Amino acid sequence: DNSYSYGWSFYFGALSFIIAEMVGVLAVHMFIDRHKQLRATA
Amino acid sequence: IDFSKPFMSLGISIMIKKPQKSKPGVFSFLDPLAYEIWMCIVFAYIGVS
């Protein structure tokens, strides 16, 4: 479709991305740890 | 009308806004790519990682 600028709803969707990837890492890190506990008892 | 002999000489000439210093910015190395690409390289680097 100028001085277009971005607002806080754009930067929330950008900040949401960052928090989602970090929780994804954290959730994988918990999955790894659950399975390592199983291997330990073995 | 009548005129005396001239008291001052002149010719038509051109006036311009002499110069334009344009001191380049400190963070000007990032001009080639727009601000969106840069922010989107940081987002496409966190995803890839």
Cβ atoms within 10 A of the Cβ of B39, count?
14
Declared resolution, Å: 3.4
Structure tokens given for B22: 């344009």
Residue B46 in contact with partner chain A when CB distance is under 8 A: yes
The whole-angstrom separation of Cα B45 and Cα B49 is 6
> Hey, are the CB atoms on A17 and B39 less than 8 Å from each other?
no
Which DSSP string corresponds to chain B? ---PSPSS-----------------TT-TT-SS-HHHHHHHHHHHHHH-
The whole-angstrom separation of Cα A21 and Cα A28 is 11
Interface test with A, best of B38, B43, B48 (most A CBs within 10 A): B43
Experimental method: cryo-EM
Residues of A within 8 A of B47 (CB-CB) are 21
Residue A31 in contact with partner chain B when CB distance is under 8 A: no
